[PDB]
Amino acid sequence: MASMERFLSVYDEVQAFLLDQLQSKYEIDPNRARYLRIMMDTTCLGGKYFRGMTVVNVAEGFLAVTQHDEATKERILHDACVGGWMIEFLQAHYLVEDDIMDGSVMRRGKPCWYRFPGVTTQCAINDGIILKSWTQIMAWHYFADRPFLKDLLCLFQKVDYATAVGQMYDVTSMCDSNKLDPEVAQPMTTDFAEFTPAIYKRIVKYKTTFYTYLLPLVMGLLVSEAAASVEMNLVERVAHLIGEYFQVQDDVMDCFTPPEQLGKVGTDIEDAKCSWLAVTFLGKANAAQVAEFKANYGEKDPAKVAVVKRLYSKANLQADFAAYEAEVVREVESLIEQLKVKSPTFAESVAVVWEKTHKR
Amino acid sequence: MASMERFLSVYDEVQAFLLDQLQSKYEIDPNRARYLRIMMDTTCLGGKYFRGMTVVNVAEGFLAVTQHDEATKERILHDACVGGWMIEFLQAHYLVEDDIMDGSVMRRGKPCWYRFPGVTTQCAINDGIILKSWTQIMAWHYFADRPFLKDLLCLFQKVDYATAVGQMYDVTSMCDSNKLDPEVAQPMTTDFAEFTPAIYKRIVKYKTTFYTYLLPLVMGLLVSEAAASVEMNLVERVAHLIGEYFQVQDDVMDCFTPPEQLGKVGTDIEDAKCSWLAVTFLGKANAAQVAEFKANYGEKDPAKVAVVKRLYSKANLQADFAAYEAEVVREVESLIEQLKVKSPTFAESVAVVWEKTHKR
Ligand SMILES: O=C(c1ccccc1)N1C[C@@H](CO)[C@@H]2Oc3ccccc3[C@@H]21
Ligand SMILES: O=C(c1ccccc1)N1C[C@@H](CO)[C@@H]2Oc3ccccc3[C@@H]21
Ligand SMILES: [Zn+2]
Numbered sequence: 001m002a003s004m005e006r007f008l009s010v011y012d013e014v015q016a017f018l019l020d021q022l023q024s025k026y027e028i029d030p031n032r033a034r035y036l037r038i039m040m041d042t043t044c045l046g047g048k049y050f051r052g053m054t055v056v057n058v059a060e061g062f063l064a065v066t067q068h069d070e071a072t073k074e075r076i077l078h079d080a081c082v083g084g085w086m087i088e089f090l091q092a093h094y095l096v097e098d099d100i101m102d103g104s105v106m107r108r109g110k111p112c113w114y115r116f117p118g119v120t121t122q123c124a125i126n127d128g129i130i131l132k133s134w135t136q137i138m139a140w141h142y143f144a145d146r147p148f149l150k151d152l153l154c155l156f157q158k159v160d161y162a163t164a165v166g167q168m169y170d171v172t173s174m175c176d177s178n179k180l181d182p183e184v185a186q187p188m189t190t191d192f193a194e195f196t197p198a199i200y201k202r203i204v205k206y207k208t209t210f211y212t213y214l215l216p217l218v219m220g221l222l223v224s225e226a227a228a229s230v231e232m233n234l235v236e237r238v239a240h241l242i243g244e245y246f247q248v249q250d251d252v253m254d255c256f257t258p259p260e261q262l263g264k265v266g267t268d269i270e271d272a273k274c275s276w277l278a279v280t281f282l283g284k285a286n287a288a289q290v291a292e293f294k295a296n297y298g299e300k301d302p303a304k305v306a307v308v309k310r311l312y313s314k315a316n317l318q319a320d321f322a323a324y325e326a327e328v329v330r331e332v333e334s335l336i337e338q339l340k341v342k343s344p345t346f347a348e349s350v351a352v353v354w355e356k357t358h359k360r
Numbered sequence: 361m362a363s364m365e366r367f368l369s370v371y372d373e374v375q376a377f378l379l380d381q382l383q384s385k386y387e388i389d390p391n392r393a394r395y396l397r398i399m400m401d402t403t404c405l406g407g408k409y410f411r412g413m414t415v416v417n418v419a420e421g422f423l424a425v426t427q428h429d430e431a432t433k434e435r436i437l438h439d440a441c442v443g444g445w446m447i448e449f450l451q452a453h454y455l456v457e458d459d460i461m462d463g464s465v466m467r468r469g470k471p472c473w474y475r476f477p478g479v480t481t482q483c484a485i486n487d488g489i490i491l492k493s494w495t496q497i498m499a500w501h502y503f504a505d506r507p508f509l510k511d512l513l514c515l516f517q518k519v520d521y522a523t524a525v526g527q528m529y530d531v532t533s534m535c536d537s538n539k540l541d542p543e544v545a546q547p548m549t550t551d552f553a554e555f556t557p558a559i560y561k562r563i564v565k566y567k568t569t570f571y572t573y574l575l576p577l578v579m580g581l582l583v584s585e586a587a588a589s590v591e592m593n594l595v596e597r598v599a600h601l602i603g604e605y606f607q608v609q610d611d612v613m614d615c616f617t618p619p620e621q622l623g624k625v626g627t628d629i630e631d632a633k634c635s636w637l638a639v640t641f642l643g644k645a646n647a648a649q650v651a652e653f654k655a656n657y658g659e660k661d662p663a664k665v666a667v668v669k670r671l672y673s674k675a676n677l678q679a680d681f682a683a684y685e686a687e688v689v690r691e692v693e694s695l696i697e698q699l700k701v702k703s704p705t706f707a708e709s710v711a712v713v714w715e716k717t718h719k720r
């Protein structure tokens with residue numbers, strides 16, 4: 001069976017399980033079951049399933065070099081699918097809640113969930129709660145007797161938390177830290193002193209890299225009972241590096257990719273986000289350019305946004321991007337080499353992860 | 361040591377733990393640590409701590425009849441405190457997110473978290489996420505080697521899920537079930553055919569009773585390694601009964617308790633909630649009264665809300681309330697008797713739970 005069809009089949013299985021359980025144990029009625037079914041589909045399906053498929057790919061790599069009964073190979077692949085769906089549902093949770101938090105309009109060329117007419121924010125916030133709760137229901141049901149259950153729940157839990165911490169770093173990235181205070185409405189920074197490499201890296205590491213790259217890789221290891229074929233500190237380092245790169249690309253596309261291709265109208269400039277463009281721009285700008293940036297960034301006014309875009313184009317950031325990319329290729333290659341020592345298989349899965357990120 | 365001072369001390373301990381861990385492992389800075397500290401205090405403190413103190417009270421009951429080393433008694437009490445805080449933090453999560461969902465203005469005579477000037481909905485939604493994530497951090501840290509860890513995590517997880525399902529039942533309680541559809545903006549019911557005893561009971565059982573009464577009771581059992589002194593089906597039945605009563609009282613107060621005493625301006629009538637008042641009213645009204653109710657319920661207009669209030673006063677619901685109360689006293693007493701068979705101690709803790717609910 002091809003991996004994707006296995007993964008998609010398991011979605012139908014897991015869906016059926018969750019909805020049958022709501023009927024048998026939670027007293028649900030058919031219409032509310034249907035609402036949840038549609039919610040699940042709308043929020044969890046239609047992306048590339050990169051995250052969930054990474055769990056499957058890591059597990060397949062181990063299967064090719066480890067002796068097992070056929071039924072064991074099936075059980076491991078089933079588990080890697082369930083585990084992959086746990087990640088996809090965790091993402092779904094964060095995309096639902098993030099879109100409400102940010103007042104986002106679209107996602108993947110469709111309206112954000114909360115904007116569907118029969119949803120509304122009042123329901124959507126809870127719908128996103130349910131999404132994450134379903135990850136735990138999946139784990140407890142499918143992995144009840146598994147030796148990796150403890151480690152998988154503990155890992156999931158740390159990654160979820162890291163992600164919410166990351167979200168906090170992100171939403172607060174345009175405030176001055178010394179001014180944070182629940183009692184006082186928060187001004188946007190005027191100095192941009194916090195738009196640094198170190199601060200950017202912190203936002204991205206927590207907000208994205210733990211759930212997008214560390215969790216799929218380590219989950220594949222856990223369902224394969226392979227966590228001793230790796231040095232975990234290498235896995236962490238390479239995850240943090242590739243994830244950073246992913247976000248840098250996402251940031252560039254927010255400003256420069258046509259909305260029909262992006263699946264949304266990018267607003268990082270108006271939202272005053274700590275983007276790779278803004279930090280790299282401020283890293284090379286002269287006094288006049290810095291001043292022009294301050295006068296126009298973080299404003300909904302299209303005139304001011306076009307001024308920021310012009311400032312980015314004029315500042316030749318494509319060159320800094322090529323240079324960053326070179327350095328990431330170097331470091332990722334180095335880490336892949338170091339991972340070959342203990343597991344050539346795992347190293348190859350990481351190479352694939354990197355190719356899929358680097359090319360897209 | 362008196363139970364409350366132990367419980368409050370453990371809050372400071374747990375706080376310190378969480379915030380020290382953010383600094384040592386999550387790269388947090390002092391100002392964001394302070395924001396989180398203030399968030400935690402604001403959202404988790406200042407209620408009666410009924411839920412968390414129930415875990416402590418159940419555990420103390422067992423201590424009085426079970427032989428243990430002093431250090432064991434301390435360890436059990438510490439665990440019951442941590443477990444109680446897990447529940448208080450879970451509530452905090454749900455109150456933060458519910459207040460945003462409902463556009464609530466106050467809670468306990470203070471502004472809802474999301475309305476603090478330096479919070480905003482964008483941060484508050486994530487703050488409520490963090491709140492729940494902290495329950496898991498607490499459990500994994502404090503209960504890492506405990507024999508009850510699995511059962512406690514699995515129970516917590518089921519109660520959280522039940523609660524979010526309950527939230528869905530609640531927010532959708534004024535729609536006609538056959539009309540639920542993410543694609544279509546939802547009209548309020550015109551027939552009120554779903555304002556029934558069975559439907560009300562379902563909302564309350566899931567939205568409130570699992571986290572307010574079942575979880576504190578069973579958590580006390582788990583931290584005491586006492587789950588075999590009880591018949592779990594009795595524990596469930598008595599929790600569901602007392603919790604229902606709690607909600608019925610809450611519903612009456614929403615309409616009839618002065619706002620300064622309530623800690624908020626009640627809006628169940630304007631929000632078209634499936635309240636005990638509306639279901640009991642529709643259970644005894646004549647055709648004219650039903651029609652007047654339909655013409656005025658679920659509208660912000662104060663004139664229409666006063667008409668609904670007048671309809672409730674005129675319909676002598678205090679009498680139905682006294683009758684309900686009598687029947688609950690009966691049934692709770694019966695269940696307490698049945699629980700004395702296996703554990704007089706546990707039965708007494710349940711009696712206390714009931715006294716504190718029944719009197720308040
Ligand atoms: O893109 C690069 C880069 C790095 C190494 C070699 C060549 C280019 N940099 C360095 C800083 C320039 O302002 C920016 O901080 C960053 C933090 C994380 C990821 C990326 C960047 C940005
Ligand atoms: O309050 C009572 C009651 C019950 C038993 C004896 C005396 C009074 N009832 C019965 C139904 C009247 O419309 C209401 O459905 C309910 C569902 C749950 C809790 C409470 C009620 C309400
Ligand atoms: Zn966001």
Ligand SMILES: [Zn+2]
Pocket residue numbers: 250251254
């Ligand atoms: Zn982006």
Ligand SMILES: [Zn+2]
Pocket residue numbers: 458459461462530
């Ligand atoms: Zn609510």
Ligand SMILES: [Zn+2]
Pocket residue numbers: 610611614
């Ligand atoms: Zn209420």
